[PDB]
Design a protein around this ligand. Sequence first.
Ligand SMILES: N[C@@H](Cc1c[nH]c2ccccc12)C(=O)O
Length: 454
Amino acid sequence: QRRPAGKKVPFQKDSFLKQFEKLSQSRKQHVLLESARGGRYSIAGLDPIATVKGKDGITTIKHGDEMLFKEGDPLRAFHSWFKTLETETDHELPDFQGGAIGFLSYDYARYIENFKMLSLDDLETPDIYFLVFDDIAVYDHQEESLWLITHVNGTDNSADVKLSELERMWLTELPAVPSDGSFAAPFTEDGFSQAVEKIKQYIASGDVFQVNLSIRQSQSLSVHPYQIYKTLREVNPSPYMAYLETPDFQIICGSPELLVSKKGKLLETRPIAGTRSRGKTDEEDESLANELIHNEKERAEHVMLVDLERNDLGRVSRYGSVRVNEFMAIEKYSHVMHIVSNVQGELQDGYDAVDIIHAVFPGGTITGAPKVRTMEIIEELEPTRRGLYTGSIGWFGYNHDLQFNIVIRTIYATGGQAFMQSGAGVVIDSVPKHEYRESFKKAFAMQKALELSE
Ligand SMILES: N[C@@H](Cc1c[nH]c2ccccc12)C(=O)O
């Protein structure tokens, strides 16, 4: 009889964000998924019922005094436990009605494809990490309402008591309250350049069409990570932002990109590929958008990545159900514009959350085409494990819905350092120095956010 029970309250976005900051201060582990520019929902998880950590074939589920552990595919280990908490969808509640919020490391891909063990794991990022929530606050930006949601079995005055405690917590103004390690070096310029030349050799030879090659920069963290998040929200607000805090690492995510969503049977992915800086004039913007959309090399790159996503979603979709409902729109983000497409499919009966992740993860747009060969080349060339970079942050619903971003425009804070990773799409005619500089430019929002925070 397990089901979600929710209360809808009129509420202001800024009240929600301020109350989150105040409440989260007393919580060792918490997460915010924020729609800071576009998007409908912002999701606060304060008090987890469980912590799920998977690394190198071992998964731990910490739930009160109990720590459950099992070997194998960490997501399969997670799913077999998580299935016991499954619920029916309440169509009155938001898309997220309770469940797991966290991340899949890029290195979760090692359970999907056979990877060589070449790149150095110096950050020891979990392969999966989820906070599981019966109790959540979901802000609906479209209805300007706060949903407070709990879970019960059978008993319905049980629900009302818990919802009253959540109301007390969220609708009561909170008092005025007060507020090292050694890692591998970045890819050198010479190292990156020699890797660009190696990728071009593989392209010439017909192994791949395009590879995202990335560089990991780091600075000393001199301010609280949440301050960096608040700055990034100002510098570059995005529809798939996230802040996740634990004692060992914090994540400051400014992603604009959806990897995959599932609402009932409907699967969607939203590949972004092709870019220009916004104009000064908001008419310059029309002409820059017009230039981007008439640019045959950006269109070719975009169509290639849409085909790759069609094939990925096709692996778990009813035959003939995969459609591009939105093909090659320009969408203006805070400081750039992108070519963006929307790819939909109907989930074939018998495929579950793990099957969907195995089909689409990691995203085509941050590896290359074809994906499996591209990941082999990345692993051969990049000196360090990607970890969270080009992984996915999001949620698994108890009702079997899900929603994951792609981790780009993200700072990972651990061991007194802030880590910032960005890449460039290497192609047949790439100039090593151009792609090196292009990866530093992609890191601007994040180094800027850091500098402003002091
Ligand atoms: N933009 C999503 C919610 C969201 C915000 N940040 C996220 C990060 C990851 C996944 C989802 C999200 C929505 O409105 O539906």
